[PDB]
């Protein structure tokens, strides 16, 4: 009765490892929550916006989550790191709070302790398998190398890739872990060239990838580079410049240059709060805005249906978010079959479609229609 | 329960332009704050820590500042951008609020509206002048170029530099402005070589400087590179690696590898709160902790002397911070006759000494004792 306070809490890497993505992501959550208040998107609710920088340290994330459950009574958890989410799964499950991660690791929505975790988009695995499919269409028996961030995040899609490579007749000849501060990748690239690698697939944030491309260009190599969600967009172009030309990127998001109410809104909100241009255009600002938008829309549905806002009512709002009752903010693509954001008790992936985009003269251009990977489902679910 | 709440407010670039510096700086403010609470530095008071990311946008900084005055009645301001500080001097003077900036621009403490602003360390102008002095004893009549950040921060020491150079018989042949995303610095460096530049002095953060060093190393160039406070430290090493070998750097801080209670405190505080290792060694983590330590010691002394914590009593505790009451936390160097941190109504610079250090084997090594530049006082004050 009257205005109530509701806490929207995100914990992730505004600084520290992976912060190329966590900074714009965190910023979008804070901004959207700010916009929810100004436009009164949820009648009778003022959002208390809590955005914590855990710097990719799982102990910081746990402490911030415990504080947020105990003190702020959160009905939802906007989370970040793969490693952190893996570690908190038992506790998330125990206290039944719906959790929407920036991490797209499929293991998060696999048993046990998976009833409350909802992936806004396709997983690292589907992305990587989608890219491998694209590789096998180009060139049979292609030699491919994986380069991966040194963490549970980098390692996430490695097993689905090996088994997909096997199914497609490709050979994964190496897998290397490369983190930030990779000033000189000469040795690694020379190793790949000796072994006849022809395609390098990346699972990383954009700074390590950019460094590798810069060196690749410098040395004049012919291997093609591809990458999953966090590797690309305008961020990669800004760090790699022309060394990005021809990079192939798998993602569920619309680009900054496409026409969508959601992309339009990201721009409007970004300018409103004076974000720098490169935040406004980041695909990760889009990514955070979708996560906060999902949370804010489930809170709204909870208010309309139950007139009470709890982990339980918010849960019920999310698992009813399907069919004609799906959420279509225009942030991510949809299959010509499907809708944009839809969940059920048994379907925990929001935007199940993705595309492959190619970097051309400084901009990522779609070279596919939205699609789902049946190959991913065979190798992963059997 | 029952404890007096004192708000410690900082606004700066946690992300956006200059964030290579602002992030560790803001992290140190927050941590020194948590630590004051853990240890109850000031009896009967709890510090509430408001650390805000303005992304180097002056409009955000001003809005954050006004809000913190209205809602928290802050007794001190920890500020950041040189540009934001220049714009706020009248309001700071109006509010009679001691302001301790990250910015070291000498013009902040020049009249008018300069009564409430205190530099913790040496200014940009004296660092640049000190460096030009190092150049003239090595090579009479040397050709030098200045490369600066494209903002008031970058341009801050240029007039003192021109003045000094002319006193020394050096020829400043070019001043260039380069910001972040300077991926290719070839055109600029080639223009330097054709102009016969033999020394490059940088006024900048670490990222752009690093990009220039790596290009210069690729091109086999032999100009010597030098830089003011924000250009160097373990952060420049991490970004530039070997290309930084030989860089000459002017700062007032102790190094991470030196032995000091203050440096010991920063490692202990940083590991206590799970900061990444690179933040913990950052000189800008040291720099922010000094700023926060001064703010906290002044509040402490105000409490003890006056039984009230206000903008007025904090100010009195700052201008009495001299002689027998000078402050010696051990973050910054002192001269032999001198002392670490001392202010008067008339002396608004804390640690007046600086050193020149040289990068050898990925570590900055002092190459001088602490000193002050008479030449700087000649050109700037007469
Ligand atoms: C940790 C990983 C999943 C990714 N950088 C997040 O988001
Ligand atoms: C603005 C300037 C002085 C610096 N980058 C800060 O502090
Ligand atoms: Na779905
Ligand atoms: Na002094």
Task: Please indicate whether, in this complex, the C-beta atoms of A184 and B241 are within 8 angstroms of each other.
Answer: yes
Fold classification of A123-259+353-382 (topology level):
Rossmann fold (3.40.50)
Task: Please indicate whether, in this complex, the C-beta atoms of A14 and B15 are within 8 angstroms of each other.
Answer: yes
Task: Please indicate whether, in this complex, the C-beta atoms of B55 and A276 are within 8 angstroms of each other.
Answer: yes
CATH architecture of B1-122+260-352: 3-Layer(aba) Sandwich (3.40)
Q: Is the Cβ–Cβ distance between A191 and A216 less than 8 Å?
A: no
Contacts of A276 (CB under 8 A, 6+ apart): B16, B17, B55, B57
Q: Among A25, A82, A149, which residue has the most ligand 1 atoms within 8 Å of its CB, making it the best to mutate?
A: A82
Give the closest of B17, B59, B241 to A274, CB-based. Answer: B59
Torsion of CA A247, A253, A255, A258, to 10 degrees: 130
**Between A and B, how many CB-CB pairs are < 8 A?**
48
Query: What is the DSSP code string of B118-157?
Result: -EEE--HHHHHHHHHHHHHHHSTT-EEEEEE-SSHHHHTT
Looking at CA atoms only, how far is residue B11 from chain A in angstroms? 15
Pairing mode, if any, of strands B355-359 and B248-251? Answer: antiparallel
Query: What is the DSSP code string of B194-242?
Result: HTT--EEEEES-HHHHHHHHHHHHHTT---EEEE-GGG-SHHHHHHHGG
Cα A238 to Cα A244: distance, rounded to the nearest angstrom = 9
Query: What is the DSSP code string of B171-197?
Result: EEEEEEE--TT----HHHHHHHHHTT-
Cα B18 to Cα A239: distance, rounded to the nearest angstrom = 16
Numbered ranges of CATH 3.40.50.2300 in chain A: 1-122+260-352, 123-259+353-382
Instruction: Count the Cβ atoms, other than its own, within 10 Å of residue A356.
Output: 19
Identify the three-state secondary structure at position B109.
coil
Distances (CA, A) of B78 to A264, A367, B40, B85, B152: 36, 50, 20, 10, 18
Beta-bridge partner residues of B45: B4
Does the beta carbon of A125 sit less than 6 angstroms from any atom of ligand 1?
no
Contacts of B70 (CB under 8 A, 6+ apart): none
Place of tokens 């199914």: A167
Identify the three-state secondary structure at position A257.
coil
Report the residue of A50, A53, A182 to disrupt the B interface, i.e. the one with the largest count of B CBs within 10 Å.
A53
Chain A touched by B150 (CB under 8 Å): no
Find chain B residues with C-beta within 8 A of A17's C-beta: 276
Pick from A252, A297, A258, A302: nearest CA to A104: A252
Cα A189 to Cα A193: distance, rounded to the nearest angstrom = 6
Q: Is the Cβ–Cβ distance between A228 and A198 less than 8 Å?
A: no
Q: Is the Cβ–Cβ distance between A4 and A73 less than 8 Å?
A: no
Rounded to the nearest angstrom, the distance between the alpha carbon of A208 and the centre of ligand 1 is 14
Instruction: Count the Cβ atoms, other than its own, within 10 Å of residue B329.
Output: 18
Q: Is the Cβ–Cβ distance between A132 and A170 less than 8 Å?
A: yes
Interhelix angle for B124-138 vs B374-381, to 10°?
120
Cα A233 to Cα A329: distance, rounded to the nearest angstrom = 20
The backbone torsions φ and ψ at residue B140, rounded to the nearest 5 degrees and listed phi first, read -60, 140
Place of tokens 């250009």: B231
* Ligand 2 atom closest to the CA of B103, numbered from 1: 3
Q: Is the Cβ–Cβ distance between B365 and B358 less than 8 Å?
A: yes
Chain A touched by B187 (CB under 8 Å): no
Place of tokens 């630590």: B35
Chain B touched by A283 (CB under 8 Å): no
Task: Please indicate whether, in this complex, the C-beta atoms of A15 and B14 are within 8 angstroms of each other.
Answer: yes
Task: Dig out the tokens for A14 from the structure.
Answer: 């505004």
Chain B touched by A57 (CB under 8 Å): yes
Does the beta carbon of A311 sit less than 6 angstroms from any atom of ligand 1?
no
Find chain B residues with C-beta within 8 A of A14's C-beta: 14-15, 53
Cα A167 to Cα A378: distance, rounded to the nearest angstrom = 10
DSSP B255: P
E-only strand ranges, A191-233: 199-203, 224-227
Find chain A residues with C-beta within 8 A of B240's C-beta: 183
Distances (CA, A) of A13 to A56, A102, B26, B268, B360: 5, 11, 15, 22, 32
Cα A151 to Cα A343: distance, rounded to the nearest angstrom = 28
Q: Is the Cβ–Cβ distance between B218 and B171 less than 8 Å?
A: no
Give the closest of B57, B275, B279 to A274, CB-based. Answer: B57
CA angle A147, A148, A154 (to 5 degrees): 160
Pairing mode, if any, of strands B364-366 and B355-359? Answer: antiparallel
Beta-bridge partner residues of B366: B357
Give the closest of A15, A181, A239 to B23, CB-based. Answer: A15
Ligand number nearest to the C-alpha of A341: 3
Distances (CA, A) of A201 to A54, A130, A182, A207, B220: 28, 11, 17, 15, 33
Rounded to the nearest angstrom, the distance between the alpha carbon of B310 and the centre of ligand 4 is 23
Identify the three-state secondary structure at position A130.
helix
Does the beta carbon of A153 sit less than 6 angstroms from any atom of ligand 1?
yes
CA angle A204, B209, B163 (to 5 degrees): 160
Chain B touched by A245 (CB under 8 Å): no
Cα A375 to Cα A156: distance, rounded to the nearest angstrom = 17
Question: In which element (H, E) is residue B45 found?
Answer: strand B45-53
Chain A touched by B238 (CB under 8 Å): yes
Chain A touched by B279 (CB under 8 Å): yes
Contacts of B120 (CB under 8 A, 6+ apart): B100, B287, B290, B291, B294, B332, B341, B350, B351
Task: Please indicate whether, in this complex, the C-beta atoms of A27 and B17 are within 8 angstroms of each other.
Answer: no
Query: What strand order describes the sheet that includes B45-53?
Result: B45-53, B4-12, B77-79, B99-101
Side-chain-side CA neighbours of residue A173 (13 Å): 17
Cα B164 to Cα A70: distance, rounded to the nearest angstrom = 60
Cα B343 to Cα B321: distance, rounded to the nearest angstrom = 5
Beta-bridge partner residues of A250: A356
Cα A369 to Cα A346: distance, rounded to the nearest angstrom = 26
Residue of chain A minimizing CA distance to B25? A15
Contacts of A99 (CB under 8 A, 6+ apart): A76, A77, A78, A79, A85, A88, A92, A116, A117, A118
Find chain B residues with C-beta within 8 A of A274's C-beta: 55, 57, 59-60
Cα B210 to Cα A23: distance, rounded to the nearest angstrom = 22
Task: Please indicate whether, in this complex, the C-beta atoms of B55 and A274 are within 8 angstroms of each other.
Answer: yes
Longest dimension (CA), chain B: 69
The backbone torsions φ and ψ at residue B282, rounded to the nearest 5 degrees and listed phi first, read -65, 140
Query: What is the DSSP code string of A282-349?
Result: -HHHHHHHHHHHHHHHHHHHHHHHHSS--HHHHHHHHHT--GGG-B--SSB---SSS-SB---SS--E
Q: Is the Cβ–Cβ distance between B38 and B30 less than 8 Å?
A: no
- Buried b or exposed e, range B196-234, using 16+ CB within 10 angstroms: ebbbbbbbbbbbbbbbbbbbbeeeebebbbbbbbbbbbb
Instruction: Count the Cβ atoms, other than its own, within 10 Å of residue A37.
Output: 15
Instruction: Count the Cβ atoms, other than its own, within 10 Å of residue A182.
Output: 17
Cα B172 to Cα B145: distance, rounded to the nearest angstrom = 6
Find chain B residues with C-beta within 8 A of A55's C-beta: 274-276, 279
Contacts of B55 (CB under 8 A, 6+ apart): A274, A275, A276, A279, B13, B14, B15, B16, B17, B19
Side-chain-side CA neighbours of residue A294 (13 Å): 36
Query: What is the DSSP code string of B304-335?
Result: HHHS--SHHHHHHHHHT-SGGG-B--SSB---
Question: In which element (H, E) is residue B53 found?
Answer: strand B45-53
Beta-bridge partner residues of B48: B7
Cα A137 to Cα A140: distance, rounded to the nearest angstrom = 7
Beta-bridge partner residues of B78: B10, B100
Radius of gyration of chain B (CA): 20
Cα B97 to Cα B117: distance, rounded to the nearest angstrom = 8
Give the closest of A57, A275, A276 to B274, CB-based. Answer: A57
Give the closest of B53, B238, B279 to A181, CB-based. Answer: B238
Rounded to the nearest angstrom, the distance between the alpha carbon of B53 and the centre of ligand 2 is 14
- Buried b or exposed e, range B266-285, using 16+ CB within 10 angstroms: beebbeebbbbebbbbbbbb
| Preceding omega of B122 cis (within 30 degrees of 0) | no
């Amino acid at each position: 009765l009257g205005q109530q306070q509701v806490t929207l809490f995100w914990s992730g890497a505004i600084t520290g490892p992976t912060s190329d993505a966590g900074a714009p992501y965190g910023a979008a959550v804070e901004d959207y929550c700010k916009w929810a208040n100004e436009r009164k998107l949820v009648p009778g609710v003022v959002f208390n916006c809590v955005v914590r920088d855990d710097q990719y340290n799982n102990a910081n994330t746990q402490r911030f989550f415990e504080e947020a459950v105990d003190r702020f009574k959160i009905p939802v958890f906007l989370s970040y790191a793969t490693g952190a989410n893996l570690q908190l799964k038992p506790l998330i499950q125990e206290l039944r709070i719906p959790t929407i991660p920036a991490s797209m690791h499929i293991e998060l929505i696999d048993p046990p302790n998976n009833d409350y975790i909802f992936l806004p988009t396709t997983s690292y695995s589907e992305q990587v398998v989608a890219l491998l499919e694209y590789i096998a269409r180009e060139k049979k028996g292609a030699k491919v190398a994986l380069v991966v961030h040194p963490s549970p995040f980098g390692r996430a899609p490695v097993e689905d890739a090996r088994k997909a490579a096997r199914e497609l007749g490709l050979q994964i000849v190496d897998v290397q872990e490369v983190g930030s501060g990779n000033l000189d990748n000469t040795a690694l690239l020379k190793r790949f060239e000796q072994a006849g690698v022809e395609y390098v697939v990346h699972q990383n944030v954009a700074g390590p990838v950019a460094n590798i491309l810069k060196d690749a260009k410098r040395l004049g190599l012919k291997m093609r580079h591809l990458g999953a969600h966090y590797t690309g967009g305008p961020d990669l172009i800004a760090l790699a410049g022309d060394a990005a030309e021809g990079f192939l990127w798998a993602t569920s998001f619309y680009m900054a240059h496409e026409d969508t109410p959601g992309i339009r809104l990201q721009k409007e909100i970004g300018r409103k709060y004076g974000r720098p241009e490169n935040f406004i255009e980041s695909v990760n600002y889009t990514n955070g805005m979708l996560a906060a938008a999902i949370a804010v829309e489930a809170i709204r549905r909870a208010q309309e249906r139950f007139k009470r806002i709890t982990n339980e009512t918010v849960y019920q709002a999310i698992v009813g978010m399907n069919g004609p009752n799906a959420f279509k903010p225009g942030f991510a693509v949809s299959t010509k079959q499907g809708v944009e954001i839809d969940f059920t008790k048994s379907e925990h992936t929001g935007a199940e479609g993705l595309r492959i985009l190619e970097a051309k003269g400084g901009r990522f251009v779609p070279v596919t229609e939205p699609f789902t990977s049946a190959l991913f489902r065979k190798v992963h679910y059997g």
